[PDB]
Write a protein that binds this ligand. Sequence first.
Ligand SMILES: C=C(C)[C@]12C[C@@H](C)[C@@]34O[C@](Cc5ccccc5)(O[C@@H]1[C@@H]3C=C(COC(=O)Cc1ccc(O)c(OC)c1)C[C@]1(O)C(=O)C(C)=C[C@@H]41)O2
Ligand SMILES: C=C(C)[C@]12C[C@@H](C)[C@@]34O[C@](Cc5ccccc5)(O[C@@H]1[C@@H]3C=C(COC(=O)Cc1ccc(O)c(OC)c1)C[C@]1(O)C(=O)C(C)=C[C@@H]41)O2
Ligand SMILES: CCCCCCCCCCCCCCCC(=O)O[C@H](COC(=O)CCCCCC)COP(=O)(O)OCCN
Ligand SMILES: CNC[C@H](O)[C@H](O)[C@H](O)[C@H](O)CO
Lengths: 142, 536, 70
Amino acid sequence: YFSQRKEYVASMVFSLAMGWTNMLYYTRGFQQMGIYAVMIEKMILRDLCRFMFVYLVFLFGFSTAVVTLIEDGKYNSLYSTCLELFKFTIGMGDLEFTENYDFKAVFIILLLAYVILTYILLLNMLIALMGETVNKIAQESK
Amino acid sequence: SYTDSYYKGQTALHIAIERRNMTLVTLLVENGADVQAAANGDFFKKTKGRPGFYFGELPLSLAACTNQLAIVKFLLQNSWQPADISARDSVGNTVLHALVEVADNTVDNTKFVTSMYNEILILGAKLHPTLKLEEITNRKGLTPLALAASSGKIGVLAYILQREIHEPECRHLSRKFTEWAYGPVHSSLYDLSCIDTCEKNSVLEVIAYSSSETPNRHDMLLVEPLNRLLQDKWDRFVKRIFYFNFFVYCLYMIIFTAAAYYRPVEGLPPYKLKNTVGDYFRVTGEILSVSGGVYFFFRGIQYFLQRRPSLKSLFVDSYSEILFFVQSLFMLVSVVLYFSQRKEYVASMVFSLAMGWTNMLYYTRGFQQMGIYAVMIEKMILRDLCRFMFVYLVFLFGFSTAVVTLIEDGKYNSLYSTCLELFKFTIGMGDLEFTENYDFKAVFIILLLAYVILTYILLLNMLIALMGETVNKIAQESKNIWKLQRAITILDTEKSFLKCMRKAFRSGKLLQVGFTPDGKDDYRWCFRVDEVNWTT
Amino acid sequence: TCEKNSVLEVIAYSSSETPNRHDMLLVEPLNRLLQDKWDRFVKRIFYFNFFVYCLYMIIFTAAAYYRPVE
Ligand SMILES: C=C(C)[C@]12C[C@@H](C)[C@@]34O[C@](Cc5ccccc5)(O[C@@H]1[C@@H]3C=C(COC(=O)Cc1ccc(O)c(OC)c1)C[C@]1(O)C(=O)C(C)=C[C@@H]41)O2
Ligand SMILES: C=C(C)[C@]12C[C@@H](C)[C@@]34O[C@](Cc5ccccc5)(O[C@@H]1[C@@H]3C=C(COC(=O)Cc1ccc(O)c(OC)c1)C[C@]1(O)C(=O)C(C)=C[C@@H]41)O2
Ligand SMILES: CCCCCCCCCCCCCCCC(=O)O[C@H](COC(=O)CCCCCC)COP(=O)(O)OCCN
Ligand SMILES: CNC[C@H](O)[C@H](O)[C@H](O)[C@H](O)CO
């Protein structure tokens, strides 16, 4: 701010966001409510940290395969393709095969394989593990 | 004798009985110690939020509560200063009330307390045959049976309702009367007094309208005479009345829906009737709808005034009455806005209409199969969503105001639109279409993806795991929940009944024993049960 | 009150690998002490801290919302 850069807005906003979620710290010590803060702690530190490597392997592998196969289109940059395949993981892609392009059959096979592997299989694996972690610490709530 | 505010009234006889010294008790009673002193200090009162020993404040109560029968017989029979068996404390609890209070639904405690209760009743019959201890109520108007039912003492309740004494000169204290037995089957009579018709506070009223903290609220209905009573009342007359009420409610909602759908669209209510068929039927439907709203309104007020529920348990019990009452309130507010010449009555009417259908789920209670869904919806809403709202709103507001602050000039530049879109993202129907030209786009993307990962993936599945655990918690308890709801329905149907008859009795006013302590005979509304048991 | 190293400090600031870190607080004098200190004076201080943090965040939000756009 004092260095004459408008980029301070960016830093400010992150603190503002964090400032609200840190109010979960004050749920600790209520017998009913503290379990939610604990569950979030355990899930972020254990489950997402371990799952991240697996998912990034799958994401980068299929993403770079798609970018290599495609030439001259929207899917010709790592940025857009990573965004799109990540959208497919969390079930908000669209698989609209409405482009004129080469090796269309192989492109379709790859996207279907990725969708099955990440949406159906991996994501429910993670959700199963998170459910295990959540149920494991209900009885320790006291 | 202790004179402070903590041990007020404690004296030597209490110490001797407490120490289990027969010799010192005999000497103290010999020397003229008061056998009816009241030790009512704060250490000795009935209380939960302070360590203490409540026994009923009297030496006889102390002796009974401590499993010392010899001292009880001494105090009652000894001629230096005999003890009154029917004495009461400051709470009004007699020895039997004190015995009920010290139960804890364990095997050995059940054996002790049941034994001491039985012996005291026999001795009371012998000493004062015209005395009826079991009809003495404490300060709150509870008999020992009602106190046991309210407190959830399953052992004492099971003992009392199934009490039998095979001995003359005390047989009139029995309640279960075995008339015959065959190989696997035996037929008996059950006394039934103050189960159905006591006029003050019956057992079924106490069990049904308990405050949901009672440790065995639903197991108490499995005790045999109660279970047979509820089944008989259900099959005899209540079942038909319940189905009739459900059918009438269905007709009411059909009329209400039809009237609501065909509202006039012209401005400025109220609207005047034209001499045409559709107007007559529409106005008829409106009048019936408002009538139904007024009916449910006054039923709600009657319920709340009769029960007087506390704020802490206002919703934990009485969920259904609250929802029916809120439906009534929306209907009345709609009527007020209608005759006040405002369009906004449509808004109020609509909410009542929606509520009117979902309250149909109240009638799936009392089915063994179907009532579990109504119960699950209630518990999920009352526990999981109400606790989870604070957490989720903290996240929503944090990222919402962050994004609004970052962005200048766009659709994401007001709290309303950004809160709605972030909510859409949380339930998995966003767009993520990062196609707008605006500054700080990288930070915007980082914020939004962090929000998606935090709320869509993580928190939402946390909620779902918790709700699923709740459902699996009560997959098992269906059988008991069904019975409890059926009991509440039966009592509620008994209370109104809209015929001026109170034929709530089961079997005849039969002579039970015929041989009282005096020359009279007792007719007691006994109820016949033929039980079967394949043991041996 | 130890002045060097008390029991509650040792239990509370343990490294989470201690086998009975949760059960050690159920020992009766400790459980009563924590309940007593909570009800005596700490509970009001904690609620006051939470209230002040709420006010702080509201002030921060309002100040950030109305930043100048030049
Ligand atoms: C320092 C770490 C470890 C951390 C800091 C930030 C970036 C964080 O994301 C993480 C990584 C992350 C990012 C996005 C999704 C999942 C995980 O986890 C926390 C950190 C994690 C969260 C979410 O965790 C919470 O529910 C807050 C919280 C939970 C439990 C508590 O006991 C607690 O006490 C203070 C606070 C909030 C953020 O700080 C936040 O508001 C933003 C913008 C990102 C979250 O990085
Ligand atoms: C009075 C309360 C507590 C309540 C009243 C309304 C606003 C309610 O939303 C809530 C809050 C809410 C709103 C939206 C989603 C979840 C919860 O829960 C009920 C209330 C909750 C429901 C949903 O609950 C049901 O399944 C009805 C029901 C379940 C079990 C029963 O035993 C029962 O007997 C009457 C009825 C129906 C609504 O009343 C309805 O139709 C509308 C429009 C909103 C629902 O507020
Ligand atoms: C399940 C747990 C593990 C999950 C891991 C999450 C992985 C998600 C990966 C998504 C990356 C999507 C990046 C968006 C690309 C983009 O939209 O483009 C970006 C825009 O800039 C940025 O926002 C910087 C990158 C954002 C930082 C992002 C962490 C570059 O610039 P261009 O606009 O010119 O791209 C020109 C092309 N149109
Ligand atoms: C179907 N197009 C997107 C939907 O609107 C919805 O957002 C999405 O399909 C769900 O998240 C997956 O079930």
